[PDB]
Amino acid sequence: SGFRKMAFPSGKVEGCMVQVTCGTTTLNGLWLDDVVYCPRHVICTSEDMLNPNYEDLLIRKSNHNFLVQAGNVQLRVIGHSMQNCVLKLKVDTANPKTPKYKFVRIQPGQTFSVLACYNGSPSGVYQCAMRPNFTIKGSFLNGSCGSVGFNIDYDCVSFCYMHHMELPTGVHAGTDLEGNFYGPFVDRQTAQADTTITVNVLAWLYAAVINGDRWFLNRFTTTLNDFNLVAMKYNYEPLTQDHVDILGPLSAQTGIAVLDMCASLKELLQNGMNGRTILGSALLEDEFTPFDVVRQCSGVTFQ
Amino acid sequence: SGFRKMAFPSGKVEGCMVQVTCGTTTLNGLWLDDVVYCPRHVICTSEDMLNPNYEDLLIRKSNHNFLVQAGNVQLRVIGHSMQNCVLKLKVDTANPKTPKYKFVRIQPGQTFSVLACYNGSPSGVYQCAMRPNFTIKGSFLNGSCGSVGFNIDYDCVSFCYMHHMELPTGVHAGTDLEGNFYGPFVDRQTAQAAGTDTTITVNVLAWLYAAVINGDRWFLNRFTTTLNDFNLVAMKYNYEPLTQDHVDILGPLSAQTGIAVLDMCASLKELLQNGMNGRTILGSALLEDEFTPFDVVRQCSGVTF
Ligand SMILES: CCNC(=O)[C@H]1CN(Cc2ccc(Br)cc2CC)CCCN1C(=O)c1cncc(Cl)c1
Numbered sequence: 001s002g003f004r005k006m007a008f009p010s011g012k013v014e015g016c017m018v019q020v021t022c023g024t025t026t027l028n029g030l031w032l033d034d035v036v037y038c039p040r041h042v043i044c045t046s047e048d049m050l051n052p053n054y055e056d057l058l059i060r061k062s063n064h065n066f067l068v069q070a071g072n073v074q075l076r077v078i079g080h081s082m083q084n085c086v087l088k089l090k091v092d093t094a095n096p097k098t099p100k101y102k103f104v105r106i107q108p109g110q111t112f113s114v115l116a117c118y119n120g121s122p123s124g125v126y127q128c129a130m131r132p133n134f135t136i137k138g139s140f141l142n143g144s145c146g147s148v149g150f151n152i153d154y155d156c157v158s159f160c161y162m163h164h165m166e167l168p169t170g171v172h173a174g175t176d177l178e179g180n181f182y183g184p185f186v187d188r189q190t191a192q193a194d195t196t197i198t199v200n201v202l203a204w205l206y207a208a209v210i211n212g213d214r215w216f217l218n219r220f221t222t223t224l225n226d227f228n229l230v231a232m233k234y235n236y237e238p239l240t241q242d243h244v245d246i247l248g249p250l251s252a253q254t255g256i257a258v259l260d261m262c263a264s265l266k267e268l269l270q271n272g273m274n275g276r277t278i279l280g281s282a283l284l285e286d287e288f289t290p291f292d293v294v295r296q297c298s299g300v301t302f303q
Numbered sequence: 304s305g306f307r308k309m310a311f312p313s314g315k316v317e318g319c320m321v322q323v324t325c326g327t328t329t330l331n332g333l334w335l336d337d338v339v340y341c342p343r344h345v346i347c348t349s350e351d352m353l354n355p356n357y358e359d360l361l362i363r364k365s366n367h368n369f370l371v372q373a374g375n376v377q378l379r380v381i382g383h384s385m386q387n388c389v390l391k392l393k394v395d396t397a398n399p400k401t402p403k404y405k406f407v408r409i410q411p412g413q414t415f416s417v418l419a420c421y422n423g424s425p426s427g428v429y430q431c432a433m434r435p436n437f438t439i440k441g442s443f444l445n446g447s448c449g450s451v452g453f454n455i456d457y458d459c460v461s462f463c464y465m466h467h468m469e470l471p472t473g474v475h476a477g478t479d480l481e482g483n484f485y486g487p488f489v490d491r492q493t494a495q496a497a498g499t500d501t502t503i504t505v506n507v508l509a510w511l512y513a514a515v516i517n518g519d520r521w522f523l524n525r526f527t528t529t530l531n532d533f534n535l536v537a538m539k540y541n542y543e544p545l546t547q548d549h550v551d552i553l554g555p556l557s558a559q560t561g562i563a564v565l566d567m568c569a570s571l572k573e574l575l576q577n578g579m580n581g582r583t584i585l586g587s588a589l590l591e592d593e594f595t596p597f598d599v600v601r602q603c604s605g606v607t608f
């Protein structure tokens with residue numbers, strides 16, 4: 001029993017974190033095989049940040065303008081290139097701790113673990129979701145750029161996020177490991193200013209039932225259309241048939257039809273909790289996916 | 304910016320997890336140097352668990368009764384003993400990945416990271432607190448026994464918890480790594496209930512400081528209070544007493560924000576008496592009590608390991 005924000009064990013990613021220096025700037029890089037990946041804004045001065053021309057900034061650099069430190073060891077850079085908004089530094093040592101890995105670009109609503117790092121050294125691990133507005137609500141300070149997000153299903157590290165910047169509202173923006181930003185954002189200090197992830201809230205209500213609580217259910221059902229008309233009034237994302245399909249295994253394990261759980265959520269939005277909690281929370285939680293619930297919860301419902 | 308429940312990086316601990324088998328039971332062990340530590344209840348059959356005589360049950364066991372697997376490698380058991388509620392298995396191989404470590408017994412209110420493991424394999428990491436009633440609100444399934452909790456203190460893994468059992472209410476009980484239980488619990492399948500829990504006051508204050516650091520200020524007010532008056536309110540609301548030591552421990556956060564602890568205590572007093580009036584703090588509608596003062600400083604200052 002129990003239900004926690006549960007990250008992946010971080011060791012496989014810890015063994016890949018390095019420090020990258022260009023000029024007076026230091027940030028984190030990801031060392032996989034003989035390549036180090038990092039945000040390309042490492043090549044910018046403070047002045048460069050409003051309207052950088054990365055091609056013009058990069059052409060002026062040699063390999064030896066980049067320093068890479070792995071623990072107490074300097075790695076020699078023997079090539080460099082830019083792919084979208086990431087810099088790739090070829091180094092003369094392959095990382096012996098490289099895990100089995102892949103790069104995946106995720107969709108809004110998906111979750112991942114973040115290993116927050118400073119100066120190439122891991123500080124902590126926490127769970128995040130890609131918000132509907134393509135930001136993440138991270139916890140990041142000066143020096144955190146190049147920290148990554150990942151999942152480790154089936155003993156393969158799937159890297160899905162690299163941290164690039166904090167927006168004025170205090171939320172976070174970054175890229176996939178091919179250097180393409182999530183959302184409309186750009187690696188420029190220019191103005192570039194969310195909803196609740198409905199499918200995740202439903203998943204978490206299923207978790208609550210699996211773990212033994214049913215107080216929030218009701219005798220009603222809903223059409224999908226009526227559910228969306230109501231939920232959108234509370235700034236919830238539309239629930240699609242794909243979402244309904246993804247909830248199928250949790251529905252089967254609990255005996256609660258997806259549209260019946262939708263009816264329960266409609267009523268929770270109308271009524272509140274009447275002083276109760278669900279899985280320890282007094283608000284509806286939206287950063288657990290259906291897959292995350294199946295990962296963490298028992299396969300047997302506490303009936 | 305931002306504030307998350309944050310665990311320590313788990314890699315140093317991952318390299319210590321092994322699988323221990325005794326008869327039909329498999330659970331997790333912690334492999335440090337040439338010793339594997341696990342719950343002593345691994346030696347019990349279901350019948351034994353109802354009223355075990357561990358002295359006698361251990362006498363009936365030999366080295367040959369235990370199997371230890373580290374990944375795909377069998378470690379040969381060459382000695383065994385128990386210390387309190389922990390079984391110690393001496394193995395033929397020292398763990399080459401043994402980190403610098405200590406065994407530390409923590410106090411109620413302190414937090415730690417849990418590496419949840421199954422079949423000797425790490426599955427997930429989360430942050431917990433030792434509750435005032437000496438339980439933890441963990442997340443554990445069948446096979447999780449022997450999972451450990453830890454902090455990293457400077458350069459050193461401080462192991463503080465080993466998981467033994469789930470109580471009827473769904474919360475968790477276990478020992479320090481010297482096998483001493485937290486709380487009035489025993490490693491027997493008999494009726495057991497924790498005391499009514501209370502809220503960890505010093506941690507709530509730490510989290511209000513975190514909220515201020517992160518720009519959430521609506522609950523500040525012109526008032527102060529005394530330690531005596533504050534504790535009358537704490538007691539009324541099922542909060543732990545605030546001691547002068549707690550005030551001292553909050554010193555760095557008080558210094559960083561410029562808000563005296565007793566000033567913040569007046570905020571908390573008003574929140575307890577009036578509720579939040581529909582507002583949230585750091586996204587929560589509850590007063591969060593599983594961040595220590597040090598947890599707030601660690602996260603707000605970017606301490607690495
Ligand atoms: C808090 C302002 N700083 C940052 O956002 C970042 C990134 N910044 C560039 C930046 C900045 C705003 C925008 Br819009 C675009 C761009 C892209 C050109 C340079 C300094 C490093 N830097 C950080 O170290 C950092 C990261 N995450 C959280 C925090 Cl508090 C700091």
Ligand SMILES: CCNC(=O)[C@H]1CN(Cc2ccc(Br)cc2CC)CCCN1C(=O)c1cncc(Cl)c1
Pocket residue numbers: 001344352443444445446447448467468469470471489490491492493495
């Ligand atoms: C859910 C019942 N199971 C458990 O509590 C434990 C421990 N149990 C013994 C037990 C049980 C309750 C008490 Br009181 C005392 C004792 C004597 C120590 C044996 C089976 C292994 N076992 C687990 O694998 C396990 C762990 N954490 C969460 C979950 Cl769901 C399971």
Ligand SMILES: [Br-]
Pocket residue numbers: 105106107110
């Ligand atoms: Br996805």
Ligand SMILES: [Br-]
Pocket residue numbers: 153154156158
């Ligand atoms: Br995968």
Ligand SMILES: [Br-]
Pocket residue numbers: 280281282283586587588589
């Ligand atoms: Br909450």
Ligand code: NA
Pocket residue numbers: 523524525526527566567569570
């Ligand atoms: Na005040």
